[PDB]
Design a protein around this ligand. Structure first.
Ligand SMILES: C#Cc1cccc(-n2nccc2-c2nn(-c3ccccc3)ccc2=O)c1
Ligand SMILES: [Mg+2]
Ligand SMILES: [Zn+2]
Length: 315
Protein backbone atom coordinates (compact mmCIF):
# COMPACT_ATOMS: atom_id res chain seq x y z
CA UNK A 1 0.00 0.00 0.00
CA UNK A 2 3.10 2.35 0.36
CA UNK A 3 4.19 1.73 -3.35
CA UNK A 4 3.16 5.03 -5.12
CA UNK A 5 3.69 4.57 -8.91
CA UNK A 6 5.38 7.79 -10.31
CA UNK A 7 5.86 8.91 -13.94
CA UNK A 8 8.69 10.96 -15.43
CA UNK A 9 8.22 14.77 -15.02
CA UNK A 10 6.78 15.55 -18.53
CA UNK A 11 4.27 12.60 -18.35
CA UNK A 12 3.36 13.34 -14.69
CA UNK A 13 2.32 16.89 -15.84
CA UNK A 14 1.00 16.18 -19.38
CA UNK A 15 -1.16 13.21 -18.08
CA UNK A 16 -3.55 15.62 -16.22
CA UNK A 17 -4.49 17.32 -19.52
CA UNK A 18 -7.38 16.04 -21.78
CA UNK A 19 -5.08 15.97 -24.91
CA UNK A 20 -2.35 13.70 -23.44
CA UNK A 21 -1.00 11.10 -25.93
CA UNK A 22 0.09 7.89 -24.07
CA UNK A 23 3.07 7.49 -26.47
CA UNK A 24 4.57 4.60 -28.49
CA UNK A 25 5.99 2.45 -25.60
CA UNK A 26 3.39 -0.36 -25.05
CA UNK A 27 5.37 -1.42 -21.90
CA UNK A 28 4.49 1.85 -19.99
CA UNK A 29 0.68 1.74 -20.69
CA UNK A 30 -0.02 -0.56 -17.65
CA UNK A 31 1.98 1.67 -15.28
CA UNK A 32 0.16 4.71 -16.77
CA UNK A 33 -3.24 3.02 -16.12
CA UNK A 34 -2.30 2.09 -12.49
CA UNK A 35 -1.01 5.66 -11.89
CA UNK A 36 -4.51 6.87 -13.03
CA UNK A 37 -6.61 4.41 -10.92
CA UNK A 38 -4.37 5.33 -7.90
CA UNK A 39 -4.95 9.14 -8.28
CA UNK A 40 -8.64 8.69 -9.40
CA UNK A 41 -9.93 6.14 -6.88
CA UNK A 42 -7.25 5.72 -4.14
CA UNK A 43 -4.26 3.42 -3.40
CA UNK A 44 -6.89 1.49 -1.30
CA UNK A 45 -9.63 0.63 -3.90
CA UNK A 46 -7.79 -2.28 -5.69
CA UNK A 47 -5.23 -4.92 -4.60
CA UNK A 48 -2.08 -4.14 -6.67
CA UNK A 49 -1.22 -7.85 -7.54
CA UNK A 50 -4.85 -8.63 -8.70
CA UNK A 51 -5.14 -5.34 -10.67
CA UNK A 52 -1.86 -6.08 -12.57
CA UNK A 53 -3.08 -9.63 -13.37
CA UNK A 54 -6.45 -8.16 -14.67
CA UNK A 55 -4.75 -5.46 -16.86
CA UNK A 56 -2.49 -8.05 -18.58
CA UNK A 57 -5.35 -10.54 -19.29
CA UNK A 58 -7.33 -7.58 -20.71
CA UNK A 59 -4.27 -6.57 -22.80
CA UNK A 60 -4.03 -10.21 -24.05
CA UNK A 61 -7.74 -10.21 -25.23
CA UNK A 62 -7.31 -7.04 -27.36
CA UNK A 63 -6.21 -7.99 -30.89
CA UNK A 64 -3.69 -6.56 -33.39
CA UNK A 65 -6.14 -4.39 -35.42
CA UNK A 66 -5.19 -0.94 -36.75
CA UNK A 67 -7.43 1.13 -34.35
CA UNK A 68 -9.70 -0.95 -31.95
CA UNK A 69 -6.64 -2.18 -30.05
CA UNK A 70 -4.91 -2.04 -26.62
CA UNK A 71 -3.64 1.58 -27.30
CA UNK A 72 -7.30 2.68 -27.92
CA UNK A 73 -8.38 1.06 -24.59
CA UNK A 74 -5.79 2.99 -22.57
CA UNK A 75 -6.41 6.27 -24.50
CA UNK A 76 -10.18 6.05 -23.71
CA UNK A 77 -9.41 5.12 -20.06
CA UNK A 78 -7.16 8.23 -19.87
CA UNK A 79 -9.91 10.60 -21.15
CA UNK A 80 -12.35 9.20 -18.51
CA UNK A 81 -9.52 9.79 -15.92
CA UNK A 82 -9.23 13.45 -17.05
CA UNK A 83 -13.06 13.87 -16.88
CA UNK A 84 -13.16 12.36 -13.35
CA UNK A 85 -10.33 14.59 -11.94
CA UNK A 86 -11.92 17.83 -13.34
CA UNK A 87 -15.37 16.75 -11.87
CA UNK A 88 -13.94 15.56 -8.48
CA UNK A 89 -17.05 15.73 -6.21
CA UNK A 90 -19.87 14.77 -8.73
CA UNK A 91 -19.12 10.96 -8.71
CA UNK A 92 -19.45 8.14 -6.11
CA UNK A 93 -16.55 5.83 -5.01
CA UNK A 94 -18.10 2.91 -7.04
CA UNK A 95 -18.54 4.95 -10.28
CA UNK A 96 -14.85 6.10 -10.23
CA UNK A 97 -13.83 2.39 -9.80
CA UNK A 98 -16.12 0.88 -12.49
CA UNK A 99 -15.84 3.65 -15.15
CA UNK A 100 -12.01 3.39 -15.45
CA UNK A 101 -12.39 -0.44 -15.74
CA UNK A 102 -15.33 0.05 -18.18
CA UNK A 103 -13.11 2.22 -20.48
CA UNK A 104 -10.22 -0.32 -20.39
CA UNK A 105 -12.64 -3.18 -21.29
CA UNK A 106 -14.99 -1.30 -23.66
CA UNK A 107 -13.62 -2.81 -26.97
CA UNK A 108 -12.43 -6.22 -25.64
CA UNK A 109 -11.77 -8.77 -28.48
CA UNK A 110 -12.81 -6.33 -31.29
CA UNK A 111 -11.92 -7.61 -34.83
CA UNK A 112 -12.17 -4.17 -36.57
CA UNK A 113 -15.74 -4.76 -37.93
CA UNK A 114 -19.01 -2.84 -37.17
CA UNK A 115 -22.25 -4.45 -35.87
CA UNK A 116 -23.63 -3.99 -39.47
CA UNK A 117 -20.99 -6.33 -40.97
CA UNK A 118 -21.67 -9.03 -38.30
CA UNK A 119 -25.39 -8.84 -39.33
CA UNK A 120 -24.78 -9.05 -43.11
CA UNK A 121 -22.05 -11.77 -42.71
CA UNK A 122 -24.53 -13.54 -40.35
CA UNK A 123 -21.89 -13.86 -37.52
CA UNK A 124 -23.04 -16.19 -34.67
CA UNK A 125 -22.69 -13.24 -32.22
CA UNK A 126 -25.59 -11.56 -34.19
CA UNK A 127 -27.87 -14.56 -33.48
CA UNK A 128 -26.97 -14.25 -29.76
CA UNK A 129 -27.51 -10.39 -29.53
CA UNK A 130 -29.68 -8.59 -32.20
CA UNK A 131 -28.68 -5.03 -30.97
CA UNK A 132 -25.34 -3.67 -29.60
CA UNK A 133 -23.87 -6.96 -30.93
CA UNK A 134 -20.16 -6.17 -30.29
CA UNK A 135 -20.97 -4.20 -27.07
CA UNK A 136 -22.73 -7.17 -25.32
CA UNK A 137 -19.76 -9.29 -26.54
CA UNK A 138 -17.24 -6.76 -25.00
CA UNK A 139 -19.12 -6.83 -21.64
CA UNK A 140 -19.29 -10.67 -21.72
CA UNK A 141 -15.47 -10.77 -22.17
CA UNK A 142 -15.07 -8.33 -19.20
CA UNK A 143 -17.09 -10.75 -17.00
CA UNK A 144 -14.96 -13.75 -18.28
CA UNK A 145 -11.72 -12.08 -17.24
CA UNK A 146 -13.34 -10.95 -13.94
CA UNK A 147 -14.00 -14.71 -13.21
CA UNK A 148 -10.50 -16.12 -13.93
CA UNK A 149 -8.67 -17.02 -10.70
CA UNK A 150 -6.75 -14.19 -8.93
CA UNK A 151 -8.53 -11.68 -11.32
CA UNK A 152 -11.51 -10.53 -9.11
CA UNK A 153 -10.29 -6.94 -8.44
CA UNK A 154 -13.76 -6.27 -6.82
CA UNK A 155 -13.44 -9.06 -4.17
CA UNK A 156 -13.66 -6.56 -1.18
CA UNK A 157 -17.14 -5.23 -2.25
CA UNK A 158 -20.33 -6.65 -0.58
CA UNK A 159 -22.65 -8.76 -2.80
CA UNK A 160 -24.63 -5.38 -3.34
CA UNK A 161 -21.77 -3.12 -4.41
CA UNK A 162 -20.44 -5.93 -6.68
CA UNK A 163 -23.86 -5.97 -8.54
CA UNK A 164 -24.01 -2.09 -8.54
CA UNK A 165 -20.45 -1.80 -9.98
CA UNK A 166 -21.03 -4.57 -12.70
CA UNK A 167 -24.31 -2.78 -13.68
CA UNK A 168 -22.32 0.54 -14.03
CA UNK A 169 -19.80 -1.36 -16.23
CA UNK A 170 -22.52 -3.11 -18.33
CA UNK A 171 -24.51 0.07 -19.05
CA UNK A 172 -21.24 2.00 -19.52
CA UNK A 173 -20.04 -0.54 -22.14
CA UNK A 174 -23.44 -0.71 -24.02
CA UNK A 175 -23.40 3.14 -24.27
CA UNK A 176 -20.28 2.92 -26.59
CA UNK A 177 -22.72 1.64 -29.28
CA UNK A 178 -22.73 4.92 -31.26
CA UNK A 179 -26.24 3.97 -32.65
CA UNK A 180 -27.54 4.64 -29.04
CA UNK A 181 -25.52 7.93 -28.66
CA UNK A 182 -27.99 9.93 -30.86
CA UNK A 183 -31.17 9.33 -28.77
CA UNK A 184 -29.14 9.59 -25.55
CA UNK A 185 -27.79 13.14 -26.31
CA UNK A 186 -31.21 14.33 -27.82
CA UNK A 187 -32.78 13.42 -24.40
CA UNK A 188 -30.03 15.03 -22.22
CA UNK A 189 -30.16 18.19 -24.44
CA UNK A 190 -33.99 18.32 -23.80
CA UNK A 191 -33.55 17.61 -20.03
CA UNK A 192 -30.87 20.33 -19.53
CA UNK A 193 -32.70 23.07 -21.55
CA UNK A 194 -36.08 22.46 -19.77
CA UNK A 195 -34.01 22.36 -16.47
CA UNK A 196 -35.39 18.85 -15.48
CA UNK A 197 -31.85 17.30 -15.51
CA UNK A 198 -31.35 15.97 -11.92
CA UNK A 199 -28.18 13.96 -10.92
CA UNK A 200 -30.05 12.27 -7.95
CA UNK A 201 -32.29 10.49 -10.52
CA UNK A 202 -30.23 7.26 -11.14
CA UNK A 203 -32.04 7.23 -14.59
CA UNK A 204 -30.34 10.61 -15.38
CA UNK A 205 -26.83 9.61 -14.11
CA UNK A 206 -26.97 6.54 -16.47
CA UNK A 207 -27.59 8.88 -19.47
CA UNK A 208 -24.77 11.33 -18.30
CA UNK A 209 -22.35 8.34 -17.92
CA UNK A 210 -23.38 7.10 -21.43
CA UNK A 211 -22.39 10.54 -22.84
CA UNK A 212 -19.06 10.57 -20.94
CA UNK A 213 -18.46 7.08 -22.55
CA UNK A 214 -19.19 8.45 -26.07
CA UNK A 215 -16.95 11.47 -25.18
CA UNK A 216 -14.07 9.19 -24.11
CA UNK A 217 -14.48 6.73 -27.02
CA UNK A 218 -14.32 9.62 -29.59
CA UNK A 219 -11.46 11.51 -27.89
CA UNK A 220 -8.94 10.97 -30.79
CA UNK A 221 -10.81 13.98 -32.34
CA UNK A 222 -9.92 16.07 -29.15
CA UNK A 223 -6.08 15.69 -29.38
CA UNK A 224 -3.49 18.03 -30.90
CA UNK A 225 -3.85 18.03 -34.74
CA UNK A 226 -0.88 15.73 -35.64
CA UNK A 227 -2.25 12.99 -33.27
CA UNK A 228 -5.80 13.40 -34.76
CA UNK A 229 -4.32 13.37 -38.31
CA UNK A 230 -2.30 10.13 -37.61
CA UNK A 231 -5.14 8.33 -35.71
CA UNK A 232 -7.53 8.91 -38.71
CA UNK A 233 -5.22 6.71 -40.95
CA UNK A 234 -5.72 3.91 -38.37
CA UNK A 235 -9.49 4.55 -38.24
CA UNK A 236 -9.87 4.44 -42.05
CA UNK A 237 -7.65 1.31 -42.36
CA UNK A 238 -10.36 -0.56 -40.36
CA UNK A 239 -13.13 1.08 -42.40
CA UNK A 240 -11.50 0.20 -45.78
CA UNK A 241 -10.87 -3.46 -44.68
CA UNK A 242 -14.57 -3.70 -43.68
CA UNK A 243 -15.58 -2.27 -47.09
CA UNK A 244 -13.36 -4.88 -48.75
CA UNK A 245 -15.21 -7.58 -46.69
CA UNK A 246 -18.53 -5.98 -47.75
CA UNK A 247 -17.53 -6.06 -51.49
CA UNK A 248 -16.68 -9.75 -50.80
CA UNK A 249 -20.34 -10.51 -49.73
CA UNK A 250 -21.57 -8.75 -52.97
CA UNK A 251 -22.52 -5.32 -51.43
CA UNK A 252 -21.34 -1.77 -52.43
CA UNK A 253 -20.10 -0.37 -49.10
CA UNK A 254 -20.99 3.21 -48.12
CA UNK A 255 -18.16 5.50 -49.44
CA UNK A 256 -16.59 6.09 -45.91
CA UNK A 257 -15.62 2.37 -46.16
CA UNK A 258 -14.77 2.33 -49.94
CA UNK A 259 -10.93 2.57 -50.23
CA UNK A 260 -11.43 3.58 -53.92
CA UNK A 261 -13.06 6.83 -52.49
CA UNK A 262 -10.06 8.05 -50.32
CA UNK A 263 -10.57 11.51 -52.04
CA UNK A 264 -13.83 12.02 -49.90
CA UNK A 265 -12.16 11.41 -46.47
CA UNK A 266 -11.77 15.11 -45.45
CA UNK A 267 -15.43 15.96 -46.39
CA UNK A 268 -16.44 12.67 -44.56
CA UNK A 269 -14.54 13.90 -41.44
CA UNK A 270 -16.39 17.30 -41.68
CA UNK A 271 -19.71 15.39 -41.77
CA UNK A 272 -18.74 13.36 -38.69
CA UNK A 273 -17.39 16.39 -36.68
CA UNK A 274 -20.65 18.31 -37.49
CA UNK A 275 -23.02 15.26 -37.17
CA UNK A 276 -21.47 13.55 -34.02
CA UNK A 277 -18.35 14.92 -32.25
CA UNK A 278 -19.21 18.66 -31.90
CA UNK A 279 -22.76 17.87 -30.63
CA UNK A 280 -21.36 15.22 -28.15
CA UNK A 281 -18.86 17.70 -26.62
CA UNK A 282 -21.25 20.74 -26.69
CA UNK A 283 -23.96 18.81 -24.70
CA UNK A 284 -21.21 17.28 -22.42
CA UNK A 285 -19.80 20.76 -21.53
CA UNK A 286 -23.39 22.03 -20.77
CA UNK A 287 -23.77 19.16 -18.24
CA UNK A 288 -20.09 19.16 -16.94
CA UNK A 289 -18.55 22.60 -17.68
CA UNK A 290 -14.89 21.66 -16.78
CA UNK A 291 -14.86 19.32 -19.90
CA UNK A 292 -14.85 22.48 -22.15
CA UNK A 293 -11.22 21.76 -23.16
CA UNK A 294 -12.62 18.64 -25.07
CA UNK A 295 -15.02 20.96 -26.97
CA UNK A 296 -12.25 23.54 -27.61
CA UNK A 297 -9.85 20.86 -29.01
CA UNK A 298 -12.65 19.22 -31.13
CA UNK A 299 -13.45 22.60 -32.84
CA UNK A 300 -9.72 23.30 -33.56
CA UNK A 301 -9.57 19.92 -35.33
CA UNK A 302 -12.79 20.63 -37.27
CA UNK A 303 -11.04 23.84 -38.37
CA UNK A 304 -7.89 21.79 -39.36
CA UNK A 305 -10.10 19.50 -41.58
CA UNK A 306 -11.58 22.65 -43.22
CA UNK A 307 -7.95 23.74 -44.04
CA UNK A 308 -7.32 20.29 -45.62
CA UNK A 309 -10.27 20.73 -48.08
CA UNK A 310 -9.06 24.26 -49.08
CA UNK A 311 -5.68 22.65 -50.06
CA UNK A 312 -3.96 25.02 -47.42
CA UNK A 313 -2.78 21.69 -45.84
CA UNK A 314 -2.40 18.16 -47.44
CA UNK A 315 -2.96 14.67 -45.88
C1 LIG B 1 -13.33 2.59 -36.90
C2 LIG B 1 -13.99 3.24 -36.13
C3 LIG B 1 -14.77 4.04 -35.19
C4 LIG B 1 -15.89 3.59 -34.43
C5 LIG B 1 -16.50 4.49 -33.57
C6 LIG B 1 -15.99 5.79 -33.48
C7 LIG B 1 -14.91 6.22 -34.23
N1 LIG B 1 -14.28 7.47 -34.19
N2 LIG B 1 -13.53 7.91 -33.12
C8 LIG B 1 -13.05 9.10 -33.43
C9 LIG B 1 -13.46 9.47 -34.72
C10 LIG B 1 -14.22 8.42 -35.17
C11 LIG B 1 -14.92 8.35 -36.47
N3 LIG B 1 -16.05 7.64 -36.54
N4 LIG B 1 -16.67 7.60 -37.69
C12 LIG B 1 -17.86 6.88 -37.77
C13 LIG B 1 -18.84 7.29 -38.70
C14 LIG B 1 -20.04 6.60 -38.79
C15 LIG B 1 -20.27 5.53 -37.91
C16 LIG B 1 -19.31 5.12 -36.98
C17 LIG B 1 -18.09 5.80 -36.90
C18 LIG B 1 -16.26 8.23 -38.82
C19 LIG B 1 -15.13 8.97 -38.88
C20 LIG B 1 -14.43 9.08 -37.69
O1 LIG B 1 -13.43 9.75 -37.70
C21 LIG B 1 -14.31 5.34 -35.06
MG1 LIG C 1 -16.68 -0.09 -29.72
ZN1 LIG D 1 -13.91 2.23 -28.56
Amino acid sequence: GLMQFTLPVRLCKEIELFHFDIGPFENMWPGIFVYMVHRSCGTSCFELEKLCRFIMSVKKNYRRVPYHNWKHAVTVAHCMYAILQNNHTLFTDLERKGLLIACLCHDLDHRGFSNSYLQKFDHPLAALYSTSTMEQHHFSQTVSILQLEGHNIFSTLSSSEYEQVLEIIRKAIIATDLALYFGNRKQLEEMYQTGSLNLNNQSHRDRVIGLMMTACDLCSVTKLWPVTKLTANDIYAEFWAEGDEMKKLGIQPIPMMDRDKKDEVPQGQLGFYNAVAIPCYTTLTQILPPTEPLLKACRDNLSQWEKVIRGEETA
